[PDB]
């Protein structure tokens, strides 16, 4: 614009005439002068003047505010409660419009973490994710998408449209390889195995309501059905669909990667994936 | 594909089917009093609450009976 | 029969009325209720049903 | 003048000399084995049978899986 | 013999898990608006004398800002031209909601444009109008 | 309390805050009545039922409570089920 050519009238740019931002840096001031000198700020003499006031919370000698009040476990295992973090439909649908996820193919944890989608922090007792209701109204996209917790009206909205939703569970260490599973190739270990829920969540993905990974297939027909009863919409046939397989595809319930299987040694380098031959090894991972 | 010893189809012999889940139940047009949704006519008010109406003719309509 | 006289000779729909209290009054909300219970919050707000912003 | 040559990274697998006393310990485990192999593939020279668990080992794996 | 039988065919699912750098740019679709609400910078451009760019995400670059908590702004930020022209045109298009002209502030170092209280809805709406 | 820790060089956060306070997300903090469980035989039904609540802070309390805590205290918890994810944030607040 018209400013780049003010720059032909005016000198050059060398390291003599540098200037900072105006107002980047204040002053700092030192204690010579007689406005700030001489007591220095600190007043007459006494305990502060001198530099040895008491404690923080100190109340000069009767019981202080914090330790009058009783104990009561507000925090009480604070740190083994576990945490999933919420994606509502409003932002699934976002991110399948602008092409930062992939529909053809089935949606996952990875997926979802490669195109920003999410932010996932297992140190931190981060589980995974919980499909949130919020935005149903208005999803109009056919997917498969696995998540770690769900709620009822946000199945609903995703199947109403035929598409498959369902509960899987990932342990702590799984966790991790999956949100990131290129450093873990680095290493240069074989895969381990998936963990099964612990006893408390065994019962949640056990049932069918829930979708669960561990649940009869035999009772999710019954299931999807009094859904399109309750919510009023017509449970569509995804048999008929030319992308059933797609929506069908589901993982071992022992299983990290899709394609690939547990015990296995993937060699980056070189473009190559190094298989066990040994009886006790096939036999370990296998169960 | 890998499989293992608790794969679906171990855990539960029975439904070894590939489509056993996403087949739509037959029948169950008389379970819960299937209301039929082509009858009735839905239409959305953004009235905050986001009102819902539905309407049908009752004598018209066939599905209830008569009584 | 206040309904037929509406429809079939005024022949128009008929108005239905209700008796409509005044809203409950609540002081000025502040930042920091001090020595109030855990329910202040309630008072203030309009809907009932969690909303998650960005996420 | 002319500038001297860029700084660069030393490429290739790396084995720290056992005997030398100030060698790190931590560049001397069998996890440091792995490592080579996993960003140099096979140039390492690691005998790609060790990356599994020894027969030893694996007994120890299967005993604390059923504890816990 | 060894204890390791290596295969190439089972790479390819090695190669979906790798992350990408770039953010990938819109896919066209047949109707707009998208169901999300998104739509497209429309072709040709506007000959106004003032251009404003989008973001590196595809969004309109209007944010609402805090400070002191309780001062109230919205800030259009990535302005190209003659940013005073766009200060006329803001005063003319929101005098008659307020009632009076709005105070606003004109950065011509960084390009910014900053106004006093929420006006993001209404200046989205706006922008998208004039096809920026 | 310590500002600058010999092994770590940070602050440290005091334990008997965290035993007795909850502070929601906005920057409220939530505590119990002194003598709750006191001699409660001697006290009339009106009296009991004030002590069972639980009371909000003055802007004094939360600024010192806020000192003596880190900031590992202070972040964005998504407990699924939490009883208190009503209470974290405001709405209609002109302040
Ligand atoms: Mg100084
Ligand atoms: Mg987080
Ligand atoms: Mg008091």
């Known amino acids: 614009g018209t400013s780049l050519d003010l720059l032909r009238s005016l000198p050059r740019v060398s390291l003599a005439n540098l200037k900072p931002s105006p107002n980047s840096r204040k002053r700092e001031r030192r204690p010579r002068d007689r406005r700030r000198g001489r007591k220095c700020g600190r007043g007459h003499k006494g305990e502060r003047q001198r530099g040895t006031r008491p404690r923080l919370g100190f109340e000069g000698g009767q019981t202080p505010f914090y330790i009058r009040i009783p104990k009561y476990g507000f925090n009480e295992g604070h740190s083994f409660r576990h945490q999933y973090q919420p994606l509502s439909l409003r932002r699934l649908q976002y991110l399948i419009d602008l092409g930062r996820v992939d529909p053809t193919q089935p949606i996952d944890l990875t997926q979802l973490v490669n195109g920003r989608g999410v932010t996932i922090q297992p140190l931190k007792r981060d589980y995974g994710v919980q499909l949130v209701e919020e935005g149903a109204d208005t999803f109009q996209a056919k997917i498969n998408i696995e998540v770690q917790l769900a709620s009822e009206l946000a199945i609903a909205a995703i199947e109403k449209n035929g598409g498959v939703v369902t509960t899987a569970f990932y342990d702590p260490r799984s966790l991790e390889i999956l949100c990131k599973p290129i450093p873990f190739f680095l290493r240069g270990q074989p895969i381990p195995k998936r963990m099964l829920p612990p006893e408390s969540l065994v019962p949640y993905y056990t049932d069918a309501k829930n979708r669960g990974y561990l649940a009869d297939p035999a009772k999710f027909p019954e299931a999807r059905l009094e859904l399109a009863m309750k919510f009023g919409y017509v449970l569509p046939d995804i048999t008929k669909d030319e992308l059933f397989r797609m929506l069908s595809a589901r993982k071992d319930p022992r299983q990290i990667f899709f394609g690939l299987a547990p015990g296995w040694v993937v060699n980056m380098a070189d473009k190559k994936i190094l298989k066990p031959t040994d009886e006790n090894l096939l036999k370990y991972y296998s169960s | ?67 | ?55 | ?68 | 013999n060894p204890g390791f039988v290596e295969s190439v065919d089972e790479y390819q699912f090695v190669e979906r898990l790798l992350p990408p750098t770039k953010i990938p740019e819109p896919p066209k679709h047949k109707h707009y608006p998208t169901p999300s609400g998104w739509q497209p910078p429309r072709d040709p451009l506007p000959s106004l004398p003032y251009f404003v760019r989008r973001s590196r995400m595809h969004n309109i670059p209007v944010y609402k800002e805090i400070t002191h908590g309780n001062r109230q702004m919205t800030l259009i930020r990535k302005v190209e031209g003659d940013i005073w022209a766009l200060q006329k045109d803001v005063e003319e298009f929101l005098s008659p909601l307020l009632g009076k002209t709005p105070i606003t502030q004109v950065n011509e170092v960084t390009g910014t444009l900053r106004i006093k209280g929420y006006f993001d809805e209404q200046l989205k709406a706006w922008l998208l109008e004039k096809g920026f | 309390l310590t500002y600058c820790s010999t092994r770590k060089g940070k602050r440290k956060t005091v334990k008997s805050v965290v035993h007795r306070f909850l502070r929601l997300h906005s920057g409220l903090w939530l505590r119990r009545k002194a003598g709750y469980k006191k001699k409660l035989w001697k006290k009339s039904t009106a009296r009991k039922k004030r002590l069972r609540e639980f009371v909000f802070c003055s802007k004094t309390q939360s600024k010192l409570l806020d000192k003596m805590t880190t900031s590992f205290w202070k972040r964005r918890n998504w407990y699924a089920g939490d009883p208190y994810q009503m209470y974290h944030d405001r709405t209609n607040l002109r302040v």
């Not at chain 2, 953004?46 to 009102?51: G, I």
């Not at chain 3, 409509?20 to 203030?44: A, G, M, S, T």
């Not at chain 4, 790396?14 to 996993?38: C, I, M």
């Open chain 3, 1 to 55: 029969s206040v309904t037929h006289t509406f429809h079939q000779l005024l022949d128009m729909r008929e108005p239905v009325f209700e008796f409509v209290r005044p809203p409950p009054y609540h002081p000025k909300q502040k930042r920091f209720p001090h020595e109030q219970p855990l329910r202040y919050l309630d008072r203030y707000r309009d809907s009932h049903e969690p909303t998650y912003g960005i996420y």
């Open chain 4, 1 to 68: 003048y002319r500038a001297p040559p860029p700084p660069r990274r030393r490429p290739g697998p790396h084995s720290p000399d056992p005997e030398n006393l100030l060698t790190p310990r931590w560049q001397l485990t069998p996890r440091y084995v792995a490592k080579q192999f996993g960003r140099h593939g096979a140039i390492s020279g690691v005998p790609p049978a060790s990356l599994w668990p020894t027969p030893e080992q694996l007994r120890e794996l299967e005993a604390e899986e059923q504890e816990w």
């Open chain 2, 1 to 67: 594909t890998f499989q293992s010893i608790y794969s679906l189809d171990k855990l539960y012999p029975e439904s070894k089917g590939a489509d056993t889940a996403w087949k739509v139940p037959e029948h169950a047009k008389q379970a819960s009093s299937y209301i039929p949704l082509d009858r009735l006519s839905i239409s959305y008010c953004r009235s905050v609450n986001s009102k819902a109406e539905v309407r049908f003719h009752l004598a018209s309509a066939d599905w209830i009976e008569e009584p």
